[PDB]
Amino acid sequence: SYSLCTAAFTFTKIPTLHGTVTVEVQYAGTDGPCKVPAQMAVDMQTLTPVGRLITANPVITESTENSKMMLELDPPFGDSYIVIGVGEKKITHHWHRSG
Amino acid sequence: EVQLLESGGGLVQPGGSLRLSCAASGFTFSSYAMSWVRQAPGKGLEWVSAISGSGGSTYYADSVKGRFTISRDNSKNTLYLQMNSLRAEDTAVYYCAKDRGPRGVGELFDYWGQGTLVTVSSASTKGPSVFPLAPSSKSGGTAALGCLVKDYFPEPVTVSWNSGALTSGVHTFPAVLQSSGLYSLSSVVTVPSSSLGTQTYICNVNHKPSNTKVDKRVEPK
Amino acid sequence: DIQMTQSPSTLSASVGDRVTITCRASQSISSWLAWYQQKPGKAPKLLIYKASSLESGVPSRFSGSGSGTEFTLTISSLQPDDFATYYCQQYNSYPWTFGQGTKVEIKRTVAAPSVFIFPPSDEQLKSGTASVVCLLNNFYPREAKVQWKVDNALQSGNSQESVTEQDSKDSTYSLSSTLTLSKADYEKHKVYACEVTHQGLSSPVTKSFNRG
Numbered sequence: 221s222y223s224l225c226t227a228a229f230t231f232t233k234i235p236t237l238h239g240t241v242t243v244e245v246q247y248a249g250t251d252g253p254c255k256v257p258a259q260m261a262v263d264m265q266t267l268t269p270v271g272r273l274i275t276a277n278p279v280i281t282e283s284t285e286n287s288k289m290m291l292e293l294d295p296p297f298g299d300s301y302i303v304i305g306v307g308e309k310k311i312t313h314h315w316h317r318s319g
Numbered sequence: 320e321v322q323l324l325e326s327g328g329g330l331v332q333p334g335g336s337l338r339l340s341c342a343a344s345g346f347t348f349s350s351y352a353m354s355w356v357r358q359a360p361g362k363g364l365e366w367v368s369a370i371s372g373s374g375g376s377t378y379y380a381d382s383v384k385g386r387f388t389i390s391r392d393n394s395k396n397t398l399y400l401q402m403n404s405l406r407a408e409d410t411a412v413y414y415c416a417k418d419r420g421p422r423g424v425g426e427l428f429d430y431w432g433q434g435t436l437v438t439v440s441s442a443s444t445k446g447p448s449v450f451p452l453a454p455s456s457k458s459g460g461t462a463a464l465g466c467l468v469k470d471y472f473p474e475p476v477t478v479s480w481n482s483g484a485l486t487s488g489v490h491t492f493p494a495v496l497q498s499s500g501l502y503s504l505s506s507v508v509t510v511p512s513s514s515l516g517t518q519t520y521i522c523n524v525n526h527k528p529s530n531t532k533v534d535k536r537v538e539p540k
Numbered sequence: 541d542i543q544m545t546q547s548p549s550t551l552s553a554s555v556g557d558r559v560t561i562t563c564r565a566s567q568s569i570s571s572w573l574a575w576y577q578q579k580p581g582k583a584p585k586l587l588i589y590k591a592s593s594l595e596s597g598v599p600s601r602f603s604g605s606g607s608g609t610e611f612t613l614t615i616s617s618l619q620p621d622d623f624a625t626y627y628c629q630q631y632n633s634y635p636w637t638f639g640q641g642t643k644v645e646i647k648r649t650v651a652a653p654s655v656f657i658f659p660p661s662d663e664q665l666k667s668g669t670a671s672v673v674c675l676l677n678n679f680y681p682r683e684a685k686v687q688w689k690v691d692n693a694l695q696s697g698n699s700q701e702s703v704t705e706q707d708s709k710d711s712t713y714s715l716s717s718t719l720t721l722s723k724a725d726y727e728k729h730k731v732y733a734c735e736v737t738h739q740g741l742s743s744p745v746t747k748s749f750n751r752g
Contacts, residue, residue, distance in 0.1 A: 223376035226424045226634040228572075249633055255376070266421070307423040308572070308590070308631065354636075364576075364584065364627055364638045380635045414583060419595075426631035427574055429595075431583035450661035452673060456747075463656045467664075467673060467718070490677070490714045492702040497720075503700065505716040507675055509654075 222279055225254035228309035232288075240274055241315065242292045245304050252280040252287065257306035260295045260315070267303055267310075271295050321345035321430045325415045328435030330444065330473050330528060331405055339435060341398040341415035348372075348396045352418035354425040355389065355400045357411035358434075360474065367413065368400065369425030376424065382408075405439045412436050438473040442500055446531035447471035449524045452505070453540040458512055464537045465490075465507030466522035470499070471529070478506045479523045485510075515539050542566050544628045544639035552681075553618050554647040561613040561626055561642045568608045569632035575604060575613050578641075579624045580705045587626075588613065620646065623706060645682075646711040650740035653679030653714075657734055657747045660726070670726040672719045674734030674747075678712040685737035686717040689746070691729045695719060726752055 227249025235242055245256070256278040260271035272294030280287055293302065297317040304311050327339040343353065354369035368379045368389040377389050388401040398415060413435055416428035452465035468476060480489050488509035494502040506522060516539075525532035543566035553559050563573065571591040576584040586595050591611055592604040601616035615622055623646050628639030653676040660670035674686055682703060688695035703715040717734055733748030 221375070223378060224371065224424060226378065226426070228570075228632070251634055308420060308426045363641050364578075364629075366636045366638070369634075369636075378634050419586065419589060424634075425636065426572070427586065427589055427629075428576075428584070429586050431585070433583050448664070448667065450664040450671075452658045453661065455749075456656060460654050460656065463654075463675060463677065465658070465673075465675070467658075467661075467671060469664075469671065490675075490704050490716075492704045492714065492716050495700040495702045495718070497700060503671075503718060503720075505673055505675075505702070505718060507656075507677075507714075507716065509677060 222253060222255050223251075224257050224306055225249055225280060226251055226307070229256075229304050229311055231304070231311055231313060237292070239294070240292050241295050241302075242290060243302060243304070243313075245289050245291065247280050247287050247289070248285060249280075250283055250285060252283040255279055256289060256291070256304075257310070258291050258293065258302075258304050260293060260300050261303050263301050263312060270300070321417070323415050323417065323430060323432035325413065325432045325435040328413060328437040330438050330440065332441060333406055333439055335405055335439075336401070336403040337405060337437060338402065339400040339413055339415075339437075341432065343396050343398065343415075343417065346417070347421070349393045350421040352423045352425045353391070353398045354416050354418070354428060356414045356416055356428060356431075357409075358414065359411045365411070370398070371424065372422050378425065402437075405437070407439050410438050410440070436473070436475055440473070440500075442472050444529045445470060445472045445501060446529035447476060447504075447524060447526050449522065449533050449535045451535055451537045452507065453537065454515065455540060462510045462512055462515060463507060464510070464520055464539075465505060466524065466535055466537065468504040468506065468524055470497075470501040470503065471526055471531075472501050473528050474502060475528060476502075476504060476524065476526045478504070478525075480506075480508055481521055482523060485520065541635060542569060542630050542632060542637050544630055544637055546626075546628050546639035546642045549640065549642065551642060551644045552647050553644070555618050555620055557618050559615045559618055559644060561644075563606075563611045563613070563628035563639050565609050565630055565632075569630045571607055572630055572632040573606065573611050574629045574631060576627045576629065577624045578627065584627065618644075618646075620708065620711075646706055648680050648711040651678060651680040651710075651712055652740040653677055653684070653736065653738060655734070655736050655745050655747045657732070657749060659732070659749055659751065665723055668723050670721050670723055672732050672734075674717040674719070674736075676713075676715045676736060676738075678707070678710065678714060679738055679740065680712050681739055682706075682713045683739060684713075684715055685735075686715065687735035687737075688717065688719045689733045689735060689748075691731055728752065
């Protein structure tokens, strides 16, 4: 059982896999190993978790700064916002699924 | 209506344990993260611990880690802090604050409660001694009287003038820790030249730790 | 642990003046930085988050600025209820550390104190001790000097002082020097006086009494 990371995340190499999607993040923190908060939503509306988030129980396994991470998620069709974090450093992007 | 009310503090011997509570009322508790911040008397704010909205995540400060445990009861809207190996340096007013944003980690402390005091020491509860500060200085300076609260422990002592009627010109200075380890407090009030035989002045001291509330009538000498 | 250090540790200014507090971090924290206000005896209040964003209810004279390492809090025109101690906090990472604080005080016209002395109550003498109290009332600035002279001999290591917080109506201070002696050792002297040296007194004022 781990605690969620309290630092800030980054959006590096932007991306599909004929259904699922992949995104790489960079954690600027030393509290590792913590749970990486990742989800999809429709934002400014109590970010209700939509989608599936395929990657199993993502955790920053090391206490070293600027670790890289591959995360694959199941975003819904249409426009969406891949949220990576929890708190005030929660980053958000935009997605569109094959319409 | 965000109202927070800390409870469960007081005096405990070094090495003992005590647990605090915090009844949150004015918001959806199952959605916001709460934290514990302490303030040593005369010093700044130190962060103690913070817990998530679900309780799945819980963070502690190194000076506290492995001795305190933060807990949450989302059913009863209360928050706890189990302190099991208290030392002297843990003496502070512990505050119960809530995250400025729902489903967070405790980055910011939006609302604060007024707190509860924990004093960790090997001394015993000692009730104060209240002696009058008789007013003389014979159309005088402008008149001055008061009360001397002496040799009490722990720190929480409240004094009022004339069952809360006298409230202008009153001066309640902070207590000074004497070399014996007991506190001493002075409370004073300036009143009109004349009115000294007309209206009588009483200081009401209350030391909740020792249950020694008292009404000392200050007569002129 | 990210180290927040504020500057300066103590401020003095008059109403209408612009004051600027500073907060430097040990490392770069972009804009993750809050500011709180604490009035003596009350809990802190959130005033500004993410460096420059005001919290609903905070007046417009409060503003924030800064990024990375050096942030400042500015009050456009000081008002009589803005006097408090102000803390700094980075929430860039855990554990959320604070600064040491910055105490904002109100400047005012120099005010001379009314000095009063109080002999020990008999009630206390029966117990076994004797404490004389010297009271400085409604004087500015806070900087004061109280000296105990027993039979014209200066005292040390027997007195304890304590100054009240700045008053909200007249922005004045008030301290109290408590001189405590044994009943046996009290009974042997006659005159008891406290000497007061202030910035608003022409010459030292001393108020005394002789008994014991």
